[PDB]
């Protein structure tokens, strides 16, 4: 079974809103809401990966960020390790840089059912802040 390391960024503004994108209809976890992110490549660290992925996907450079949660999840056809970075400072303004839907969502209003099931403990912990 495919085994992947994935780095994602929880992009939180000053009004307790998170920048959330929606996955393509033909992707793994199609049509789900997501934290921007993607696969950690050979030769790059988890910290470098979340910077690169947020630059590619939403056009920001995260800075002074922290590891909010790291977990493993077994999907029906792949195993992934997710690195959830809490990003409260960045350069740039997030947008749908890859043509994908993106918008600011209140943290209290997040519905874990809208996200991949791997995100369930993270969304709960975020609402604990
Ligand atoms: N980008 C992103 N991927 C997620 C999240 N939760 C989650 O299970 N995944 C999975 C879906 C994909 O299998 C993989 C991400 O890789 P891509 O973004 O390259 O598709 O990680 C998330 O919040 N953000
Ligand atoms: O691992 C993140 C953790 O490390 C600290 C320093 O103790 O921050 C460092 O690492 C971050 C991720 O690369 C950088 O963004 C940051 O500038 C650097 O100091 C903690 O702040 C953080 O919890
Ligand atoms: Mg991605
Ligand atoms: Mg990507």
From TrEMBL:
Family indicated by similarity: Belongs to the Nudix hydrolase family.
EC code(s) of this entry: 3.6.1.55
Binding site for 8-oxo-dGTP: 23, 28, 34-37, 119
GO biological process, one term: DNA repair
Cofactor(s) essential for the protein: Mg(2+)
UniProt keyword list: DNA damage, DNA repair, DNA replication, Hydrolase, Magnesium, Metal-binding, Mutator protein
Keyword Coiled coil: no
Gene: mutT
Recorded superkingdom: Bacteria
Enzyme's top EC category: hydrolase
Pfam families assigned: NUDIX (PF00293)
Secretion signal span: none
Keyword DNA damage: yes
CDD domains in alphabetical order: NUDIX_MutT_NudA_like
Catalytic activity annotation: 8-oxo-GTP + H2O = 8-oxo-GMP + diphosphate + H(+); 8-oxo-dGTP + H2O = 8-oxo-dGMP + diphosphate + H(+)
Listed transmembrane segments: none
InterPro entries (UniProt xref): Mutator_MutT, MutT-like, Nudix_hydrolase, NUDIX_hydrolase-like_dom_sf, NUDIX_hydrolase_CS, NUDIX_hydrolase_dom
Binding annotation for Mg(2+): 37, 57
Location of the Nudix hydrolase domain: 1-129
Protein name (database record): 8-oxo-dGTP diphosphatase
Entry's Gene Ontology molecular function annotations: 8-oxo-7,8-dihydrodeoxyguanosine triphosphate pyrophosphatase activity; 8-oxo-7,8-dihydroguanosine triphosphate pyrophosphatase activity; 8-oxo-dGDP phosphatase activity; 8-oxo-GDP phosphatase activity; metal ion binding
